[PDB]
Enzyme design. Sequence first.
Site, PDB file in Angstrom:
ATOM      1  N   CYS A   2       3.412   1.689   9.742  1.00 51.08           N
ATOM      2  CA  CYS A   2       3.258   0.628   8.729  1.00 51.08           C
ATOM      3  C   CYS A   2       4.613   0.109   8.269  1.00 51.08           C
ATOM      4  O   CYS A   2       5.529   0.901   8.042  1.00 51.08           O
ATOM      5  CB  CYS A   2       2.431   1.112   7.544  1.00 51.08           C
ATOM      6  SG  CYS A   2       0.697   1.440   7.934  1.00 51.08           S
ATOM      7  N   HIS A  47       0.806  -1.224   0.000  1.00 53.46           N
ATOM      8  CA  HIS A  47       0.000   0.000   0.000  1.00 53.46           C
ATOM      9  C   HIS A  47       0.847   1.288   0.000  1.00 53.46           C
ATOM     10  O   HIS A  47       0.277   2.373  -0.094  1.00 53.46           O
ATOM     11  CB  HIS A  47      -1.087   0.037   1.094  1.00 53.46           C
ATOM     12  CG  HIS A  47      -0.592   0.203   2.496  1.00 53.46           C
ATOM     13  ND1 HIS A  47      -0.191   1.440   2.986  1.00 53.46           N
ATOM     14  CD2 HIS A  47      -0.560  -0.695   3.507  1.00 53.46           C
ATOM     15  CE1 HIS A  47       0.133   1.236   4.253  1.00 53.46           C
ATOM     16  NE2 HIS A  47      -0.089  -0.028   4.619  1.00 53.46           N
ATOM     17  N   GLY A  61       2.401   6.198  10.373  1.00 59.28           N
ATOM     18  CA  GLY A  61       3.811   6.073  10.018  1.00 59.28           C
ATOM     19  C   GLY A  61       4.466   4.776  10.485  1.00 59.28           C
ATOM     20  O   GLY A  61       5.613   4.487  10.122  1.00 59.28           O
TER      21      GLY A  61
END
Lengths: 287, 305
Positions: B145, B41, B143
């Site tokens: 991820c 993503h 942030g």
Amino acid sequence: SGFRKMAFPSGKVEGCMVQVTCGTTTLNGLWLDDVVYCPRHVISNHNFLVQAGNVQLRVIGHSMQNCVLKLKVDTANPKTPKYKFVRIQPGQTFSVLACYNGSPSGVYQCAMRPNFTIKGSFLNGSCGSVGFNIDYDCVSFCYMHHMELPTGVHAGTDLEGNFYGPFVDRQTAQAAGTDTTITVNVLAWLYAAVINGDRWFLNRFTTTLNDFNLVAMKYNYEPLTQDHVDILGPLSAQTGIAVLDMCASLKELLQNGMNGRTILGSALLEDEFTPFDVVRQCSGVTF
Amino acid sequence: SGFRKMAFPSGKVEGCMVQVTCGTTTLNGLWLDDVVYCPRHVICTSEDMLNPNYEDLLIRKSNHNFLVQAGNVQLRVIGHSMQNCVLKLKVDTANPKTPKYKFVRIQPGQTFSVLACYNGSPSGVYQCAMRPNFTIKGSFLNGSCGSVGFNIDYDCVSFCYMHHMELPTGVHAGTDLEGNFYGPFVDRQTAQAAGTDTTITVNVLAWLYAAVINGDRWFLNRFTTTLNDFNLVAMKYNYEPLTQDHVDILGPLSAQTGIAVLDMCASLKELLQNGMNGRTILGSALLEDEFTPFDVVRQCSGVTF
Ligand SMILES: CCCNC(=O)CN1C[C@@H](C(=O)Nc2cncc3cc(F)ccc23)c2cc(Cl)ccc2C1=O
Ligand SMILES: [Cl-]
């Protein structure tokens, strides 16, 4: 979202752990530059065997500073990080890198209790394990493990060899004093719950500092000072709940319990997160 | 003595954390040998997140669109491929700090350490468990991820989780290191919710054995139970069914303490019925389910107090 007991990343400290052997005793040492720091209860230069991974370090000198032994080695640690030795106060938190035979096995977060003990998790061979905090790139070493008390709690020194608490380094009758709850830390954790959307305990009431301390003294809670109120200022401005407004909520939890409810997944009032830990975990500070 | 929620030392994983940027999105990557693994993503906008066609988004990308930063050094991307929900960026430099490692897919009830990162910089480490509903109760902000879950057994790092998203209830969802999600989740901003969660029964029993090892027996009783009667009671308190595998796995702890698994199951039944009555077990007022039978054997002393 979420709220966990978070330790600092331990990598900078793992690169300093060594094994120290003197006779039949084996414990952990901290290798910084050309010195290995370890509990003096480990006891000429060749009598001390220092092992860093699979490499034997040669001891070229030795001296004592309070309850810590300083072994001068012939090799500077190439993995030495930027560091300071700092003495912490009761209520302050730190990370512990638990080691056995100079090998780190785990990392956990804990607090220096008001009675100067730490509720750690250690077994035989853990002596010399260290406590630390990280601020930017600098490791602040604040604790070195020395012993376990009869109640299962732990005692140790700062990195200058000075014990935290009225303890001595020897097998004798030693007991931890009656412990108390770190009030400023409980309040910080109540602010963390409000930030994560848990507000069932908030009420319309406010209190005075004196009335709060008269109540808190009855439940074995540490007195709350004006400094603690000032330190909680940022969290008070972020949530809109004044510190003595939150004290009235804590007073109600102390006299009534939780009634089958939990706060941040806990049925007890948590006191091992400082106001700074709450701000750091609910912000995103990296190292 | 003592019993803490202990995470593995994070050093071997810290030396693999990098920052991955694609357009305006910035998240964390895992640099192992000459490959950087990160959530796919990273190629999405927030608009794309409703119904993203990753294959269509990826085809429009070239190597130089991906910026990889390791500390203060820019890594050059020389190839890219997608494997399920993970993007694999081939870089021109092998990570000199690459530890011995394996990619392992865990089952619900298993525990692991999480190294929470922001902008390729590690900020903290905590221990957690894969819930029966395949979510993790983590502590993550925007942030985070690309942060990873792992275990370190001997000197080998077993990577088992990569963070992808937060659900409406505050819980977290992610994939193994091959890009396969844990749970019925998709890397789409769809109305998906975590299923009803349950307590990891085998882990609660392990933690009751850890309490007996540390000298606490106030909760034991003189009763036993059949496995079926235990499950009929346990399922009423939202506890996971206890299988014969779980009973077999608790064998060593039963032999170490002298308390049969089904006798420990009888204490658990009674604990659920009565609560703790102002008492605690290993400093806790709730029944703890994020320590596996393996964690207890690893952390507790082999000699029962
Ligand atoms: C409810 C908060 C998250 N939702 C958002 O605002 C947007 N969001 C972005 C991203 C995501 O979830 N990022 C985060 C991951 N972990 C902790 C987060 C905490 C935070 F405060 C914000 C963001 C976080 C994402 C990725 C995927 Cl695969 C599927 C959906 C999303 C998505 O919905
Ligand atoms: Cl597993």
